[PDB]
Design a protein around this ligand. Structure first.
Ligand SMILES: *[C@@H]1O[C@H](CO)[C@@H](O)[C@H](O)[C@H]1NC(C)=O
Lengths: 438, 103, 49
């Protein structure tokens, strides 16, 4: 058989539904969202980390001349000076008032520790969802996993069940993000080849060990100092450490709907929001002919007690008469309240007690046992404890919290003087005619 | 050591501390709304939840009361004036037979 | 790049350009590639056959 139904996005909340077919008992279908897996599409842009500068041995020409060449090293720079007398422990290596010249150069490369301290800039897009479901029909359980896209059915027993699309798309990921040491930070990094001294992503590389590298961090060389050979240099602090000191808090502590986010897939998990439609195909073998199912007689509904609460705090009682033995499912045809158990042993004249919960204190609804059903009305009270994190609001409110007493007061309240007004107008017309008699 | 007050919505709230796995805590309603067949101050519960949509009903009730009262009074007064004026009667007189009914 | 942020490096002369006046893309969001050829097609999702 075939059926369809919509379920809200939420993990570990069984929903119980019925499929009705004349001549066959209505099977109880249990649907649970075991887990959620939102996986977007990712693109790698470039890596970055703390950098180490290079101060190579200088190129000193004793009583000659030199120049400022070019090279492919990232942040490569050169500069030359003349009339320099460098010294050293053995003495002065060379002195020529003008002919001496010194040439210095500088570049940079990722530090050796970068291999593990590196962060990466990611371009993300097109959030896609993967959902794991547990579906039980007639004590026939099945574990399945599928995308929410309406095209693909996940394979479980070769039963193709379609679902989606998502009611409303939610994505804590911004189009641009950064990843570091298992943490994901929402940030707007600059484009590849776009750098700013003292800013994040001052150094770039397609790979952690790629030979090609590019950066720009305001490295201007300084003139040689007094009498001692060295290379006085200058450069702005790494943007990596700066951004680290002020990167902001991780997205782990800011995502809505309690997302659980992991890096190696760059995905979210157990993050719930929205609703999903589902199409379900069922073999007719699983179905049971009604005559095989037991029949019931003169069943009554009795509310032992019920306090409005969050857990299955509502309790009900049922007295039934039957001509057969076996099992029947039970269902709450009214959405406002939902049971906790599916079926139970039956009896010729036995009675049972049932658990349930509701979104309103007004326990007025109808409930079905076997194929028959009976009404159930009562009042439930709010609880004392008002703070718990266990599953709650399994059903959303439908402005049905309005008590029957409030409806009674409202109905008798609204006036109907307009009828008196019309009667007054009619008698006015008749009296006007009578006066016209004169 | 100190104390902190965090408001929690009906939906649910996350909670972190130390270096252990967090715990999620949500909330529901417990104000004394439902009556017991006698006069009661139910409104307070409905005021504790959704301060919106709870006084709007009262405003609409007052508006309906005023509209009905004003319309009824205007119409009854005008009908009475029309029935009494061309009749041109006086109180405690013989002609006001219909008046014996009207007032 | 045409993006207004990045200047290409040539003589260390930063010249910015863009953004594009109007975006044009013959590529559809989905495509197929085979033997050096690119065909515009709407293939089904992974796991959908
Ligand atoms: C499921 O229930 C049917 C009767 O409703 C029974 O015949 C069958 O053996 C049950 N299957 C399992 C696995 O319990």
């Amino acid at each position: 058989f075939e059926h369809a139904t919509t379920v809200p996005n939420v993990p570990g909340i069984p929903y119980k539904a019925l499929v009705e077919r004349a001549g066959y008992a209505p099977l109880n279908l249990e649907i649970t969202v075991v887990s959620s897996e939102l996986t977007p599409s990712t693109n790698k842009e470039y890596v970055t980390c703390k950098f180490h500068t290079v101060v190579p041995s200088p190129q000193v020409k004793c009583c000659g001349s030199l120049e400022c060449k070019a090279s492919s090293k990232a942040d490569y720079t050169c500069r030359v000076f003349g009339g320099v007398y460098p010294f050293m422990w053995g003495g002065a290596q060379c002195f020529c008032d003008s002919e001496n010249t010194q040439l210095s150069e500088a570049y940079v490369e990722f530090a050796p520790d970068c291999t593990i301290d590196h962060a990466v800039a990611l371009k993300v897009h097109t959030a896609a969802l993967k959902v794991g479901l547990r579906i039980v029909y007639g004590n026939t359980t099945a574990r399945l996993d599928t995308f929410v896209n309406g095209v693909t059915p996940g394979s479980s027993r070769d039963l193709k069940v379609i679902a989606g699309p998502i009611s409303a798309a939610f994505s804590p990921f911004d189009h641009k993000v950064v990843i570091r040491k298992g943490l994901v930070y929402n940030y707007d990094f600059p484009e590849y080849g776009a750098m700013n001294p003292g800013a994040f992503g001052d150094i770039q590389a397609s790979s952690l060990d790629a030979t090609d590298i590019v950066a720009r961090t305001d490295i201007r060389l300084l003139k040689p100092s007094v009498k001692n050979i060295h290379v006085p240099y200058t450069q702005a602090v790494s943007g990596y450490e700066m951004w680290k000191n002020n990167s902001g808090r991780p997205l782990q502590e800011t995502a809505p709907f309690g997302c659980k986010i992991e890096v190696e897939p760059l995905r979210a998990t157990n993050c719930a929001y929205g609703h999903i439609p589902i199409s379900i195909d069922i073999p007719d073998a699983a179905f049971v002919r009604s005559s095989e199912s037991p029949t019931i007689l003169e069943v009554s509904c009795t509310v032992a007690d019920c306090i409005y609460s969050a857990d299955f705090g509502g309790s009900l009682t049922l007295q039934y008469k039957a001509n057969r033995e076996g099992h029947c499912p039970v269902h709450s045809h009214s959405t406002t309240a939902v049971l906790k158990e599916a079926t139970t042993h039956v009896t010729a004249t036995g009675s049972i007690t049932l658990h349930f919960s509701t979104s309103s204190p007004q326990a007025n609804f109808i409930v079905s046992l076997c194929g028959k059903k009976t009404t159930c009305n009562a009042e439930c009270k709010p609880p004392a404890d008002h703070i718990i994190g266990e599953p709650h609001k399994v059903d959303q409110e439908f402005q049905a919290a309005v008590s029957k007493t409030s409806w009674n007061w409202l109905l008798a309240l609204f006036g109907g003087a307009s009828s008196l007004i019309v009667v007054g107008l009619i008698v006015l017309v008749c009296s006007s005619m009578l006066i016209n008699t004169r | 050591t100190t104390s902190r007050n965090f408001s929690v919505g009906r939906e649910g709230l996350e909670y972190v501390w130390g270096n252990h796995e967090p715990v999620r805590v949500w909330a529901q309603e417990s104000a004394p709304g439902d009556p017991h067949g006698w006069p009661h101050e139910i409104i307070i519960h409905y005021y504790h939840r959704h301060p919106v949509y709870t006084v709007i009903v009262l405003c609409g009730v007052a508006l309906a009361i005023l509209v009905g009262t004003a319309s009824s009074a205007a119409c009854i007064a005008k009908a009475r004036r029309d029935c009494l004026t061309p009749y041109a009667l006086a109180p405690n007189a013989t002609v006001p037979t219909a008046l014996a009914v009207l007032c």
